[PDB]
Design a protein around this ligand. Sequence first.
Ligand SMILES: Nc1ncnc2c1ncn2[C@@H]1O[C@H](COP(=O)(O)OP(=O)(O)O)[C@@H](O)[C@H]1O
Ligand code: BEF
Ligand SMILES: [Mg+2]
Lengths: 98, 50, 106, 91, 81, 82, 93
Amino acid sequence: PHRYRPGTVALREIRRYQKSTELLIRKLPFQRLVREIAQDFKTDLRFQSSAVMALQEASEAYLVGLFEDTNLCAIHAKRVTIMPKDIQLARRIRGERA
Amino acid sequence: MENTMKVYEKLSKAEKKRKIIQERIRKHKEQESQHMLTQEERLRIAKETE
Amino acid sequence: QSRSAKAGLTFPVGRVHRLLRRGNYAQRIGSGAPVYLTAVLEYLAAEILELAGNAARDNKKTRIIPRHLQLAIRNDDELNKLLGNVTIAQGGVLPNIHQNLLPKKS
Amino acid sequence: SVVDVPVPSLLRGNLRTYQKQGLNWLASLYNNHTNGILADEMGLGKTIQTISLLAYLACEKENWGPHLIVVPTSVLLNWEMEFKRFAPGFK
Amino acid sequence: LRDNIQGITKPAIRRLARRGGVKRISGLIYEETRGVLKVFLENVIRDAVTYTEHAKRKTVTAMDVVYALKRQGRTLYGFGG
Amino acid sequence: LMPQTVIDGKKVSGFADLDAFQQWFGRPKETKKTVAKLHQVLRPYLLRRLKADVEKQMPAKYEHIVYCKLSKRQRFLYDDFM
Amino acid sequence: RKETYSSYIYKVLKQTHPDTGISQKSMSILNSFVNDIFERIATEASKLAAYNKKSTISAREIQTAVRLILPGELAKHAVSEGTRAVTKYSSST
Ligand SMILES: Nc1ncnc2c1ncn2[C@@H]1O[C@H](COP(=O)(O)OP(=O)(O)O)[C@@H](O)[C@H]1O
Ligand code: BEF
Ligand SMILES: [Mg+2]
C-alpha cells in the first residue's frame, strides 16, 4: 500500500492550515476553560458568546506568535523539532518571562 | 504601483490561460452532449443489471 | 455648506471637531487641527483600502474580507510597522516556510 | 376515478389485490400531479407498493430519473434488500 | 472545577503549531504550551473581571475584553471598542 | 404537501393559514362532526386501510397485563423518594 | 442612537474602487483602525501641547504628531496632503 514519507503530510497540512482562516481551538472546551478561570477570579460571572469568542481569538493570536518565534529560534540551533528549551528561551527573550 | 502592476500581470495571464482552457472544455462539452439513450437500450442495460 | 465640503474632505470634519472637544484631549482646539487630522485619516484610509482592494482582486474576489485585509496590511512594511501590535480577527497568517525545511536535497 | 393502470412487468413477487388498489391510487395521484399521504395500518406492504409505483413510472412513463427516498437509518439496508428483491433493475 | 486546562485537546495545540510552520514537536511542549496559555488567560481575564467590577454590571462584555487586551498592549480589531 | 411556492418572483400560497385551521377544526358531540369533516378534507390526500378488513390470515393478537410487587429495597427507595 | 465612520469608509472605497464591496467584519475592522489612529494622534497632540505649555492644539500640533507617529515616507505624504487640504480650506475662508 502507498504511504507518504515522514514530513510529506507535515508540509501538506502546513500549507492547508496556513491557507484556512477558521478558528482552530474547539469552542465549547475553551468556553468551559474560561468559565472555570473566571469562577476562580470571581464566582457567578456571566459570559456571552461574543466575549469568549474574542478572548479565544486573542489567545490564538498570542499562541501563534509564540510558535512563530520558537520556530525561528529552533532552526538556529540547527534542529528541525522544537523543544521546551526553545519555548522558555523565546519567552524570556520576548521579555514575557522576565 | 508595483502591487498594481503585479496584480494586472497576474490577471492578464489568468485571462489568457482561462480562455484557452475554456475552448478546450467547451470542445469537450460539445462532443459529450451528442450522446443520447434510447428506451430499448436502456431496457437491455436494465436486464443486465437485473 | 458643510465644512467638509469647504475643506473638500470625505470624513465628517465637524464630527471630528466635536470628538476632539468632547474627548478632553486639550482645553482648546485650533480650527486647523480638525482639518489636518481629517485629511490625515482620509489619506491613511485611502492607502489601506487601495491595498485591500488590490489584494481582493488578486484572489479574483471583490469583497474585502479579513484575510485580504491582513494580506494587504502585512505586505506593506510601514503599515506593518504602524500596526505591529494590532491583531485582526480572522486575519490568518502569512505563508512562511524556511528553506531548510523544503523536501529533498538542494 | 382511479384507473386500473397496468401491472408493471418489472414486478417480482405477487402484488396482493389491496396492494394493487394502493398502486392504482398512487398512480392516480401521479396522473393528477398531486402529492399524497399514505397511511396503512403497519405491515401491509407499503414498501412493495412503493416499488410498484416506481415500476409503473418505469414501464409506462420511462422515468427512471434520480428519485430520492429519505428514511430512518435502521430500515435503510432493509430497503436496499427489498429494492433487490422486488425490482433488482433499479440502480 | 475538575480540569479544563487539560481539556484543550492535543490536536488543537498540534494544529496551532501547524499554522506556525513547525515540522515536528517534542511531547513536552504540550504541558509547557498549556502553562503559557493558562498564564496569559489568567492575566487577561483578571483585567476583564476588574473592568466588569468597575462597570458594576454582572455580565462581562466584549468591550471589557478589548480594554483588557489594550492594557496588555495587544490591539484587537473587529469586535469594536 | 402544499407549501408556499415562488413563481416568477411572486409568492403563491397552497394551503390555509395554521391559525384559520385551528379556528375551524381545533376550537370545537360536535367533535365527531368536526373529525368527519377532517376525514373529508384528508380524503384526496389520504388512503386509509385496516388490517382486519384487508386480510384475515393472522388476526391472532393477544395483550396481557402483569402486576409486579416492589422488592423491599425497591419499595423502600420508592417510599423514600416520594 | 450611535454614530460610525462606515458610511464615509464606503464612500472613499467606492471613489477608489466602485466595484469592490465590504462585509460588516471588514467594515468594523476599518472603523476600529481609524478610531485607533485618531486616538493615537489626538493623544500625541495633547502631549505635545502640554509639553510646550500650549493650551490650544493647532495645525502645528497635529503636524508634529503625524511626523512622530507615521513612518517617515508615509508621514511625508500624509503631511503633504494635509497641508494641501488645510490651505484649500483656509482659502475657502
Ligand atoms: N405479495 C407479498 N408476498 C410476500 N410478502 C409480502 C408481500 N407484500 C408484502 N410482503 C411482506 O410484508 C412486509 C411489510 O413490510 P413493510 O412494507 O416495510 O411494512 P409496512 O407495510 O408496514 O410499511 C414486507 O417485509 C414483505 O416481506
Ligand atoms: F409501516 Be411499516 F410496518 F414499515
Ligand atoms: Mg413502512
